[PDB]
Amino acid sequence: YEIQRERIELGRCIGEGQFGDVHQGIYMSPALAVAIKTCKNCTSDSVREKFLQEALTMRQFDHPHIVKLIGVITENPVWIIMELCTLGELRSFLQVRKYSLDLASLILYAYQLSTALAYLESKRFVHRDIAARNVLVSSNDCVKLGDFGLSKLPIKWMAPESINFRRFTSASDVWMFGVCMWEILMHGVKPFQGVKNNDVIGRIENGERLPMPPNCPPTLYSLMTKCWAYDPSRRPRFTELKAQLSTILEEEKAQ
């Protein structure tokens, strides 16, 4: 899915990914607003091969809650063309809308994300660059998984087996999603604020967990705590999370 460069009008810098700046632009095939990943060092084929890898691996992915890849330009400057999430990063969206988003919206986002994570697992996709993981906002009622920002290891988000042994499985992704859920219900507050990364594993191994967010339904906090089972085998699967989140969303909308 090689795009002709003259079909792309490169606009302003809107964020960053692991390899360089992300720009807004326009793609005429007309007037589709898109985001364009650029790559600082893609004159080197070693860098170029890594920059493009997931764009190729994820090319045929199509999920409402995952940023869609549109195309690539593999001549220097190498670019990846993808859908534009016009409302930016979910963390800042939640912060600026702290007193204006209903709890039902927060639960909707968690649910949407669970559907995306179940789908990726169904494609046997393993996402290894965990530091790059991010959630973007495409509309008031739609969030999407991405690997770049708009506007080091994430120890405070990681499963105990990942911190201790660098074991990474779907179960470790479930732990991290539990943390994501907590952040959403906290209007974008990061976990373990002010805590040294070094001291996180000690707290977990003392049985401590992130506390129930204000206004979070106890059923949803219960689900988060299951994601944070120390034993990865006792964590729920993404299928179960999706089912359970759907039930929780309905209940909140009925309040």
Ligand SMILES: CN1c2ccc(NCc3ccc(C(C)(C)C)cc3)cc2-c2c(cnn2C)S1(=O)=O
């Ligand atoms: C919510 N979590 C999460 C957020 C983002 C991602 N990114 C995977 C991805 C990589 C590349 C793209 C392209 C198409 C833009 C190139 C899209 C999505 C992953 C996750 C995640 C979590 C737990 N498991 N997984 C896979 S999370 O951190 O809770």
